[PDB]
Structures are given as C-alpha cells and as structure tokens.
Design a protein around this ligand. Structure first.
Ligand SMILES: CC(C)=CCC/C(C)=C/CC/C(C)=C/COP(=O)(O)OP(=O)(O)O
Ligand SMILES: [Mg+2]
Ligand SMILES: [Mg+2]
Length: 493
C-alpha cells in the first residue's frame, strides 16, 4: 500500500483499540487555567480543601511558566495568585463573532470579581440573556450577582436571579458537565446566607475533580462528540470494523427527549454539531437498527431551523452559524423528503462566504473547520444546472483559500501565518478531497505527506487543540486529534 494507506491503517487500529466495550471512546478534557483559577478562588475564600488549593496553586504557576494560555486566562490566574483591560482587549483581539458584546461583559466581570479591574458600569439588564444553552443562563446570572455584590448593591439581586443558580448546589459532577458554570455560580452563591447550608458538600466534590496535574478541566469530557466523529471516520473506511455497532448503540441510547445529542454523557442540552455527527454516523453504520433514532435526530434539526435558512447551535431564534448550517444540510440530504430545507441551507452557506473565500470561526479557532463543513455541503448535496454552477464556484474559492494559505510544510494552522497543526490540516484535507484528484506535489498530496510525517510511533497524533468555549477560549480534549486525522484520511483515500 501507499505510505498514506499504511498511516491510515495504523491510526485506525489505534482508534478501534481506544473504544471501550461500552461502545464509547473516552474523551477527557485537560485542566484549564480559567477554571483552575476560579476553583482556587472559591476554595480559598471558603478556607476549604487546603491540599487541593495547594495543588491548584502549583498547577497555575507551572502552567504560566511553561505553557501560558491566552492573555485573558493569564490575567485571571495572576489575579488569583496575587493591565486587565489590555489583557481583555488582547484576549478579545479581533474576535469577530456575534457573541463579542456578551463576551466583553462576561470576561470583564470575571476579572472584576477577582479584584483585577473595576466592574462594568452598565445597567443591570446588560446581563439579561435570551434562553439558549442551559448553562449560559446560569453563567450570566452568576456574573450579575457577583457584580451587584461587588459594587456594593446586593439589594439589586432578585429571587429569580438566585433561582437560576440552584443546579450548582446539587451533589456529584457539575450540572451539564460544565465546571466553569458551576464555579461561577458557587462564587455567587457563597454570598447568600440561605444557600450556604448546601455549599460545604459541593466544595468537597469540586475539590475531588482535580486532575493529576493539579488543575480543573473546563468540562468532564466530550465522549458523545468524540465517539460519533470516530464512528463516522471508521464507517468511511473500506471495511469498517465490527465495533461501529456498539458505538452506534452507545450513542443512540444517550439521545435526549428532543431527539438530539449533547456533547458528553449526562448533558441534557442538545446541539446541532453533536447531533449531525451522530446522524451522519448512524446513517452509515446502523440506518435500520437505529431507524427511529435517525428519524428523531432529523426531526430535532428541522425544529431548530431558522427562517433565514440557516441553523443555530442550540436554539431557534439565536443567530444561524455557517458551520452548523452546512453540517445540517449534509446530515439531512440523506432523505429526499428534505430537499427544500437542504437547498435553502446550502444557499445560506453560499450567501455568507467572504470575499476571500473563507467563512467563519466559531466553535473551532481555525478557519479550515468551516471550510470543510461548507465544501462537503457544496459538493455532496445533489445539484444541477445553474445551482450546480453557483455551488461549484463557491467550493472552488474555498479550496483556493486553502491552497493560498498552505504552509511550507504542507499543513495549515489556526490562521494564515500560524504554524501547522494536525487538526487544522485534517479539516483542510477533508475539503481538498472534494477537489481535483491528488497529483504529486499538489496541495492535497503535500497535506497528506504532512500528516504521514506527524504520526507518532504509537500510531497517534498530538495536536494543538482547536475547540473553544466560551468562545474564543481554547480547551483541550486530546482524543480529538486522532479522530479528526482519521476522518481526514478516510475521506482522502
Ligand atoms: C464542538 C461542539 C460540540 C460544538 C457545539 C458547542 C458545544 C456543545 C461545545 C462543547 C463544549 C462546551 C461545553 C462548550 C460551551 O460553550 P459556551 O456555551 O461556554 O460558549 P459561548 O459562551 O461562546 O456561547
Ligand atoms: Mg459561556
Ligand atoms: Mg461555558
């Protein structure tokens, strides 16, 4: 076989071996500076868990010394270990996203709660948010409470604000597997005498979440997302392995009542990205075995569709997103009954392509993620006549963007001038596999050679992470590197 096929084979063996007998690919999240700093602040204020606070302190100092994060997270750590405005302007430097205004308020209020800057001089309504992802309501309310107390106006807080924080007082792992939301909520709730009876027991569980490096992860893991993407990659191999069936079973039995999927076990909030990967995987590996789950997932997506033809991440009425719209278009194209919705989705994608051929950054911090989603929809959804031409021209500009920005080593980074990483390159390979056939020395050929060269002796890949949340803050689920490279190699061979 070719070097590429040999690389694909070794990687597939590794991914298959990582899937457990429960059908799941474990996908823990690494410690993160932001949540470690908030856990340290919370435990310090409550004079609790001295051993955990010492490990968190050591984790923060080591990480700042050796692998400092973005400037906002560095400022948060320095505030707890101990200008903020310049760190926020830099951490939000050119953050081109519809959530920018909320993020400025959120991040500044976090820094102010930790004593590093003044609280935003905004009307309290600035913290109001429309229902979206379940935990985001809690984060905003926690920050409102912290601001009201921090400015000396605790009477401002209303019973409806406290009520939003009650899930943070439940025992066990964080509600919706989100440690950031629980920590912010607990930092607020410790100001409330009538909630303090429940604080002691939750602090014990929080302290118990420390990872071996002494830090706190953003989330418990991403095993649904990771298992679905890995199952899809395996189902695109010439001869998919037997384990795709228990993987499909493990995902289907975790579907939410609305028919969608969250990112990890126990996440009740469904989202379009998780659901599209599950749907794409089930369509290939178990379309009859899990016919009802497939239909429920399709119904989930259709119920979220926005009037402009695009799809949001979590809730109808929130802004459509390009990558979510392209993912849903592709996931729904398998049913000839949804031709109209699919075509309106692909037209949305074409309308929002930028003058340079790119699309958007959102849940990924590289440009190649949305390019790969868009190109799959533009080239996979059936189309003829003028609409074929329109879609072909759009896909050409996206693939041209990739060729124009390819690094000398054959890979791509998070932005045009960043060093290459395997995940950003994997997304680009998925897209390029829908262009002309590979030729010696061409962009796809060179990208595949980059991936061949980056394979570790143990068969896997190590990569800078690309996932963000809250956007644009990166978090690291290392299992995704193998999975997305395999997805790329399965598409390209
Ligand atoms: C990769 C993927 C599954 C994409 C869809 C979004 C999603 C469910 C992400 C998984 C990780 C996570 C808990 C993000 C929360 O972002 P946030 O709610 O803090 O973000 P925001 O404040 O920027 O809206
Ligand atoms: Mg958030
Ligand atoms: Mg969050």
């Amino acid at each position: 076989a070719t070097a590429v096929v040999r690389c694909r084979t070794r990687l597939a063996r590794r991914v298959v071996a990582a899937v457990g007998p429960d059908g799941l690919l474990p996908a823990p999240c690494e410690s993160r500076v932001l949540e470690s700093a908030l856990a340290l602040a919370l435990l310090t204020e409550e004079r609790a868990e001295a051993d955990a606070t010492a490990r968190l302190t050591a984790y923060l100092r080591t990480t700042l010394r050796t692998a400092p994060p973005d400037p906002f997270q560095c400022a948060v750590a320095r505030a707890v270990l101990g200008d903020a405005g310049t760190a926020l302007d830099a951490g939000l430097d050119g953050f081109d996203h519809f959530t920018a205004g909320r993020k400025r308020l959120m991040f500044r209020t976090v820094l102010a709660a930790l004593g590093a800057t003044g609280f935003p001089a905004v009307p309290w309504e600035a913290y109001d948010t429309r229902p979206q992802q379940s935990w985001l309501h809690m984060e905003m309310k926690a920050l409102k409470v912290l601001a009201a107390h921090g400015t000396g106006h605790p009477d401002v807080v209303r019973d409806e604000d406290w009520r939003a924080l009650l899930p943070a007082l439940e025992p066990g792992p964080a509600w919706e597997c989100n440690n950031l939301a629980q920590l912010l909520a607990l930092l607020a709730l410790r100001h409330s005498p009538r909630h303090r009876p429940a604080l002691g027991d939750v602090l014990k569980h929080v302290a118990g979440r420390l990872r071996p490096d002494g830090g706190m992860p953003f989330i418990d893991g991403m095993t649904v997302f990771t298992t679905a993407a890995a199952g899809l990659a395996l189902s695109l191999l010439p001869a998919p392995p037997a384990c795709v069936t228990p993987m499909a079973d493990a995902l289907a039995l975790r579907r939410n009542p609305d028919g969608g999927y969250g990112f990890h076990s126990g996440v009740a909030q469904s989202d379009v990205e998780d659901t599209c990967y599950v749907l794409e995987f089930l369509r290939r590996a178990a379309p009859d075995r899990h016919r009802t789950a497939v239909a429920e997932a399709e119904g989930y997506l259709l119920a979220l569709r926005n009037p402009d033809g695009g799809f949001p991440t979590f809730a109808r009425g929130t802004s459509s997103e390009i990558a979510m719209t392209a993912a849903a278009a592709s996931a729904l194209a398998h049913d000839p009954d949804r031709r109209e919705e699919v075509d309106e989705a692909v037209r949305y994608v074409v309308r929002h392509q930028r003058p340079d051929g790119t699309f958007e950054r959102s849940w990924s911090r590289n440009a190649t993620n949305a390019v790969f989603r868009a190109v799959l929809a533009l080239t996979g959804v059936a189309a003829h006549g003028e609409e074929r031409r329109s879609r072909a021209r759009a896909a050409e500009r996206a693939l041209a963007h990739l060729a124009a920005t390819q690094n000398g080593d054959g890979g791509w980074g998070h932005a045009e001038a960043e060093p290459s990483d395997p995940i950003s390159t994997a997304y680009a390979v998925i897209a390029l596999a829908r262009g002309p056939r590979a030729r010696p020395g061409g962009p796809l050929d060179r990208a595949l050679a980059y991936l061949v060269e980056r394979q570790h002796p143990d068969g896997g890949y190590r990569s800078r992470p690309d996932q963000a949340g809250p956007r644009p803050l990166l978090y690291d689920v290392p299992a995704l590197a193998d999975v997305f490279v395999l997805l790329a190699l399965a598409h390209a061979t």
